[PDB]
Each structure stands twice: as C-alpha cells, then as structure tokens.
Design a protein around this ligand. Structure first.
Ligand SMILES: Nc1ncnc2c1ncn2[C@@H]1O[C@H](COP(=O)(O)OP(=O)(O)OP(=O)(O)O)[C@@H](O)[C@H]1O
Ligand SMILES: Nc1ncnc2c1ncn2[C@@H]1O[C@H](COP(=O)(O)OP(=O)(O)OP(=O)(O)O)[C@@H](O)[C@H]1O
Ligand SMILES: Nc1ncnc2c1ncn2[C@@H]1O[C@H](COP(=O)(O)OP(=O)(O)OP(=O)(O)O)[C@@H](O)[C@H]1O
Ligand SMILES: Nc1ncnc2c1ncn2[C@@H]1O[C@H](COP(=O)(O)OP(=O)(O)OP(=O)(O)O)[C@@H](O)[C@H]1O
Ligand code: NA
Ligand code: NA
Ligand code: NA
Ligand code: NA
Ligand SMILES: [Zn+2]
Ligand SMILES: [Zn+2]
Lengths: 430, 429
C-alpha cells in the first residue's frame, strides 16, 4: 500500500557469507542471498556506442569489475554476467549522418574501442554480450507479450506505449519501485515507448505495428530475461540510471512475467565528478580513457577507484592532483614486490637459522589479523578503501621485518601469495 | 576401554560441510576449525640423510594439494609447520661412513629436499623447525612432562615416558589411533624422550646428563611451541600413525595435561612399487631428480591426483603408470593452446554475439561442472573425480570451440575457472 515491498530470498540451500550490499530496492544494506545455491545471475547496463568512453564510464565498469572479482575470486560465488551494447539509439543515428558512415559501422567502431579500453583497464569481459541490433526480433516478441498481458497499447502512428495506470492497478505490481517520488498519443504523460514508429531516413525494423525502433528501455528487459530468466540476482548501473531507466526495466519485466520481483539486488555506483559536476559528454568536462592511459597506468587508475567506495560519489581533481596518491601507492606496491622477491631469491637454507622467533610470531599475528580485517571489509558492502589500507599497513610491517630480522622464508612466501590473492581480486598486476 | 573424540563446536566457525578421513575416528567426519576459519597444521618432515624419492613426493605433494584446496578453494587460513629431522641415528651413521660432520650432511640433504619440493611445485610451510635449533626447548618440554609425573629418569641419564601412569588417568588414553599395536624401563612399551648419549655421539647438556632427543619428542615440542595446545590438523604417512604419531599425542597430552591435542589426524597412503612400499631400505626407490629427468612436474602431480590421497597406490615403473598421466597432461596442454588463441585472435568488430542455444548448453554444463567439483572436494578431497569432471568439460569445450560461433566472454570465464582448479591442483600451464 503506497510503498513498494521487497522479498528477501530464503537462506535454505543457499551459500551464506553474511555479505551485505547496498540494495537500491530497499535503500539500505541488506544481507545478500543467492536465488539458487552459490549462483549469481547478474545483468549490467552497457554503453551507448557512438563516441569514446571517458573516466566516468571507467569508474562504473571498473567498480563493478572489482565487485565481480570479490564475488568470484574471494567469496567463490558462481557469477553469470550479461552486458548489453546499445548500438541502436537516437545519438547513434544522429552521429552516423554527421560522420557519413553507416550506423552499424559507427556503432561497431565505438563498441570495439570500448572493449579495448576495458581490456586496457584489466576489466573482465562478461559471460555474454548482447547487442540491440541482434535482438530486435526478440524485442518484438517481448513487446507482444506485454500487450497480451494488457500492459501496453498501440497508438495510430504505429508506436507502442507502456500503460502505467493499468500496470499499477494490479495489486502485484508497483511502478517506480526505487524512485517512487520521481514520477497527445499517450493515455498519460508518464507512459513511455516500448516501440517507436520510425521517422524517415532512420534505420528501422519490421514489426506487427509498423516499421520502428526499440524504445529506450525495452532492450534491457528483453535481453536479460532471455538469457538470465525471470529472476536476476544482481542488476547494476550508474546511479543516474536508477530512474527512469531501471525502474522502467522492472515494470517491463514484471509485466512480461506477470510477477512482482524481477531483481533481488539492484546496485548503483556513484558518479565520478570533476570540479563538482558529473563527468559527462554534455558538459564537455570529460577525460577519455585513452587520454587517461597516456599519462597513467592501469594499476594507478584502478587504485583511484579502489580508494573510493563504489556506491559513493567521488571528486576527481585533474592535472594529476588525484593521481598523486595513486602513483605513490602503486610505486610502493612495485617496490615491495621488488624487495620481497629479492629477499626470497637470496635466502640461503644452508647457512641461515630457522628458529621461530618472537619477531616471526609477531609478523604472523599481524598477517592473520589482516586477513580477518579484509574479510570484514569485503562483507561490509565491498569496502575496498579500508581493505587497501589494511594491505598498505601490512606491507609497511613486512618491509621493516625484511630489513633487520632474520627472515622466515616460508612466512614471506605465504604473505606474498596472500597479497597476490588480494591484488588479483582488485585487478592489480605486479 | 575405547578412546573418545570431541568434535569442535560449530558456533563462530567457518562451515563448508567438508568431510575428511580422520584417523582418530577411523571414519569420515565433518571438518570444523577450532577458531574461525583458521587451520593450525603440523606435518612431519623428512630425515635429511639421503635423497628424497617418489614415495616422499607422494606424501608431500598430496598434502600440498589438500593445502591448496583448503586455502585457494575453500578460503581457510592455514598456518603450517614442517620439521626437519637433522639429528637422528640415521644421520649419525651416514655421517661417520662419509667422514663428514652431522650438520654438513643434514644441511646438504635438507637443501636438496626443498629443491625437490620446489621442482614439484610444492609450497613451503609457514615455519620450518629443525631439531638442532630446538634442543633446548625439547629439554624444557621433557622437564614439564616429568613434573606432571608422566616420565621418569633412568640411572644412565635417559628419560622414558611412563605409559602405565599415563593410561591410569581417566583423561588420557594411550595409542588413540592404533590401540591394538601395543630392562631399565618399568614396562617395555615405554619409549625414550631423552637418550643418554655415548660420549662419541653428538650430544647436548640437560638436567639428566648429556644426551639426544628421542625419536618422537621433537615433533611434540616444535608443534606445541608454535601452534599451541590444539592442532586443527596433523599429517603424515600411514607408517607414522603408530608408534610415532600416537606417541606424539601422549607426549603432548602429558605436557598440557589435557585429552585432545589434535582434532584431525590425516594419513596419506603409501606409494608402492611392485607391491612393496617404496623405501630406501628395500633399494626399490626412484629419486625425485631421477623422476624429473623422465617426466615433468605436471605429469608427476597428475599421477598423484589420479590416486586418492588416503588410499595406497601402486606405481608400475618403465612408464606404465605414467602413460595415463602423459595423455592427460597432453590433453590439458592442447585445450589451453586452442582456447588461448581463440581468445587472443577473437575480433569483436566482425563477430556476431547473439546468445545461442549452443552457448546456453555449454554454459549449463559449465555451471554443472562447478558443482560436481565442489562436491568432490567436500568428499574427502576426491581429486580423481574432480579431475575427471574437468576432463569431461574440456571434451565439450573442444567441440564448441572448433565449429560453433564462440562467445568470447564465456570462453574467458571457462579458462579462468579451469586455471583456478589447476592452481588448486598445483598444475602450471
Ligand atoms: N565453491 C562452490 N562452488 C559451487 N557450489 C558451491 C560452492 N560453495 C557453495 N556452493 C553451493 O552452496 C550450496 C549450499 O551449501 P553450503 O556450503 O552453504 O551449506 P548448506 O546450505 O548447509 O548445504 P546443502 O546445500 O547441502 O543443503 C550447495 O548447494 C553448494 O552447491
Ligand atoms: N561520470 C560518471 N561516473 C560514473 N559512472 C558513469 C558516469 N557517466 C556514465 N556512467 C555510467 O557509465 C555507463 C555508461 O552508459 P551510458 O548509456 O550512460 O553511456 P553514454 O550515453 O555513452 O555516456 P554519457 O552518460 O557520458 O552521455 C552507465 O552505467 C552510466 O551510469
Ligand atoms: N575468507 C575468510 N577469510 C578470513 N576469515 C574468514 C573467511 N571466511 C570466514 N572467516 C571467518 O570465519 C568466521 C565464521 O563465521 P561465518 O562468516 O562463517 O558465519 P557465522 O559463524 O554464522 O557468523 P559469525 O562469524 O558472525 O558468528 C567468520 O567470523 C570469519 O571470522
Ligand atoms: N613410499 C612412500 N609412500 C608414501 N609416503 C612415504 C613413503 N615413504 C615415506 N613416506 C613419507 O614421507 C615422509 C618421509 O619421512 P621419513 O622420516 O620416513 O623419511 P626417510 O626415513 O628419509 O625415508 P624412508 O621412509 O624411505 O626410509 C614421511 O611422511 C613418510 O611417511
Ligand atoms: Na499496485
Ligand atoms: Na535519475
Ligand atoms: Na584411560
Ligand atoms: Na606403523
Ligand atoms: Zn540498461
Ligand atoms: Zn614427526
């Protein structure tokens, strides 16, 4: 009644880690519970491929890459991830006439460069990549089912619009679950297009209602539903997408399956700001990922994001100001591996003593303690800023121990392997 | 009349539903840490007077695999200690024959032992404890046992464990794991904690006279000092179960005057060759170095992955047993060759990425294989069936990669998972 309800998955038969995540469906941190076993079905909104990707895009896809690496590499969940490519869009159509190359060729160019930028940043590719151009037929079938369930109507011009009022009336459906307060051819202004009648000279596709294009949001419901099904464990995106885009996805999918909860956990990354405003192509304040990579390394850019909680906004000071700290941390990690590898290489079993000393025991106690601190940090909504700090403090103490104390060779190797494990989870390469 | 075993409480512990073959219960029981997700683990090390052979490799590689499963796969926190027996009747005898010092001999063969372990991709333990470096702690340990009235001093200057006194206590049982295996001594089954040294043997000072540690006291002393009064895991070859390991439990119980020093005692089966344990005594042994001039580390580790860690295995020489290992290694190598190249050369610009029914079928088999292997590892580290699960998955990936249009992301995900399992096995491709 007047407020959306959320149903936590049952814990029986599920992998229970006591992980808590910031869920935009509850606007709170709640325990994460798989729908089935240790499996996570995850859909993340992808880019609109008409121009270069910038540092703001890097923040979202790197941040959810880190979260994915924590879920899989650290907690041993089984993640099945899908990311779409929006290769049909008003921006793509307009840009293609300006550039006087085919719309498919333009979209394929900037999709190719998007994945190259992701690879440059050590971002894992998803399990599946779904292009709108390859799913238009499935989109048409999806819209047909929504109409059959009486949740969409066809205008005379040949467009199809979602019927918000009819959808709300159903007791099992609520519109705008995550931003309830954000709410001629249409019944009501809040109705949004599932199928757009095509304007002349635009690319178009056949449908039962006439030549047209998919609407802004129908592509994501169709693709996620086809591959992942009627319940998603995780759906992700930047916070700007929460409404209208993500709330409208929930309405479309609920209308298709005629059920109440298409997504269990909705995660939204915070925006990267530059001089107080979201980094955006519109504001012309953006730094491309390629330009960023001519000045800084993949590790340094990922450290920038590791230092900022994924779901909070962050301020990026350009001209290297924000990257001063990132460069210092990367340099100390590189030097740590140089030193510890050298101490291991030069260790002589024949002459050195291996008595387990008080100094050895103290370092070990700090080592196991650091493992538990980092475990709590990851459970605490993927708190990488504090996990990174824990590693820094441990490295500070290993450096002291290596300089003076007689070194336990096995202890140093064990610690090196643990730090490698955490850095693999972070996406750092040393 | 029969020893009791106390399962650790589950409250506050990492619970995986792993079951292990525990020699204290002679059965498979659920593994529960004493504290959190931590595992304090002590494993008996080699007697460093000669080269290590394939039998030694079997025990240490097998427990290396178990360790990698516990840490890499289940995410336990393992604190492992391995001793080096550098003072021993064997070392002393070998050192006089070769006319070199006892320490120089032990340091040579310790060095070759760790080099052989590294060659087999066996991880070093957290701590390495040499007896020569712990003699003083051994003396203090024996003093406490005497103070608790569980050991006595002979006239010659030896110290013997008092089995009869130890048994009498209701909180103590002697020979917990092999109960049926049981002049200067009260009873013949008493064993030395301290041996009075002949003036020509190497020796150390003590309250009872110049002597050497007994065969078993060193492990109780070292494990107790570093790990404490409760060990999550203690491991060794099956031959060590009695008298060596049962005597470790008695010594440590007498020291702490409690009832359970080890929660889980794991014993690897013997590698036999032509029906007899591979042994230096039988002169039937193959050194690890000799083995590595004929076969690779991967092939040798696959040999052990194909045999359950706690069962005996027979090794047929002249390559008979290794034919299967080489075929498996070759099929892994070619699988990685194809999938790595398909990933590297894949072109996103030109390829179509619709999620087809063939993609969905492979993916379903992929997730299914993940669960099969999880059950296999929980089933007392059943690596033979986990390895076969990987083989079956690879057969289907090969079919999919050759003809069907490939999902680049799905192939990468599958590659990373198989790397993950191979890291757990200790294979390198
Ligand atoms: N690493 C993993 N790989 C695959 N599946 C896993 C993994 N870890 C946990 N699972 C799944 O987690 C599910 C729940 O098992 P868990 O360890 O949480 O104990 P449980 O719920 O008490 O046991 P059960 O599933 O037998 O009722 C199991 O079905 C198992 O398949
Ligand atoms: N400045 C930013 N900080 C963090 N995430 C961002 C930022 N800008 C965009 N994102 C996220 O990156 C992804 C890009 O998808 P989107 O469809 O918005 O791209 P685009 O339209 O090409 O770019 P832009 O939003 O700059 O116009 C979305 O998840 C969006 O939330
Ligand atoms: N990967 C890990 N790294 C470090 N410690 C871990 C790890 N996994 C589990 N632990 C430890 O295992 C302990 C067991 O608790 P677990 O998370 O399994 O749930 P619980 O016992 O039901 O909860 P609680 O710990 O709150 O009593 C945790 O407190 C944590 O200290
Ligand atoms: N054939 C074998 N198969 C499996 N494990 C073995 C074999 N031989 C020895 N081991 C184990 O290897 C380790 C070697 O330690 P140990 O003190 O017995 O070595 P050693 O005396 O030099 O060798 P050997 O037992 O051949 O005389 C022990 O854990 C022992 O149980
Ligand atoms: Na309603
Ligand atoms: Na918004
Ligand atoms: Na008794
Ligand atoms: Na025996
Ligand atoms: Zn979307
Ligand atoms: Zn021992």
């Amino acid at each position: 009644g007047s407020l959306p309800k959320w149903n936590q998955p049952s814990k029986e038969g599920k992998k229970i880690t006591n992980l808590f995540v910031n869920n935009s469906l509850t606007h709170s941190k709640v325990e994460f519970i798989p729908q089935e076993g240790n499996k996570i079905k995850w859909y993340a909104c992808g880019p609109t491929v008409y121009d270069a990707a910038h540092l703001g895009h890097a923040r979202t896809y790197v941040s959810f890459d880190i979260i994915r690496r924590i879920l899989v590499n650290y907690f041993k969940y089984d993640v099945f991830m899908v990311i779409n490519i929006t290769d049909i869009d008003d921006k793509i159509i307009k840009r293609s006439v300006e550039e006087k190359i085919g719309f498919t060729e333009l979209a394929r160019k900037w999709e190719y460069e998007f994945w190259e930028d992701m690879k440059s940043l050590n971002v894992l590719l998803p399990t599946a990549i779904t292009r709108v151009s390859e799913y238009v037929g499935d989109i048409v079938k999806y819209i047909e089912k929504i109409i059959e369930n009486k949740y969409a109507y066809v205008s005379e011009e040949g467009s199809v619009y979602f019927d918000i009022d009819e959808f709300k009336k159903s007791e099992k459906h609520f519109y705008a679950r995550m931003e309830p307060l954000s709410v001629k051819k249409k019944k009501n202004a809040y109705d949004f297009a599932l199928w757009k009648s095509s304007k002349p000279n635009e690319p178009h596709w056949d449908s039962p209602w006439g030549k047209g294009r998919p609407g802004w949001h129908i592509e994501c419901s169709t693709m996620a539903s086809n591959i992942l099904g009627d319940v998603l464990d995780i759906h992700s995106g930047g916070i700007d997408l929460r409404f209208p885009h993500h709330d409208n996805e929930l309405a479309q999918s609920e209308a298709f399956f005629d059920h109440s909860q298409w997504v269990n956990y909705f995660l939204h990354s915070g925006h990267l700001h530059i001089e107080g405003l979201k980094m955006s192509k519109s504001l012309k304040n953006f730094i491309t990922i390629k330009n960023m990579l001519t000045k800084y390394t993949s590790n340094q850019i990922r450290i920038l994001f590791l230092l900022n909680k994924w779901d909070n906004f962050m301020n990026y000071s350009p001209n290297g100001e924000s990257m001063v700290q990132c460069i210092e941390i990367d340099k100390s990690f590189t030097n740590f591996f140089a030193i510890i590898l050298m101490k291991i290489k030069n260790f002589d079993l024949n002459s050195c003593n291996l008595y387990w000393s008080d100094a050895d025991n103290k370092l070990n106690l700090l080592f196991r303690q650091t493992k538990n601190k980092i475990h709590e940090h990851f459970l605490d909504n993927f708190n990488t800023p504090d996990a990174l700090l824990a590693i820094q403090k441990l490295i500070t103490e290993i450096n002291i121990y290596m300089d003076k104390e007689k070194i336990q060779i096995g202890l140093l190797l064990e610690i090196k392997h643990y730090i490698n494990f955490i850095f693999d989870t972070f996406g750092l390469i040393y």
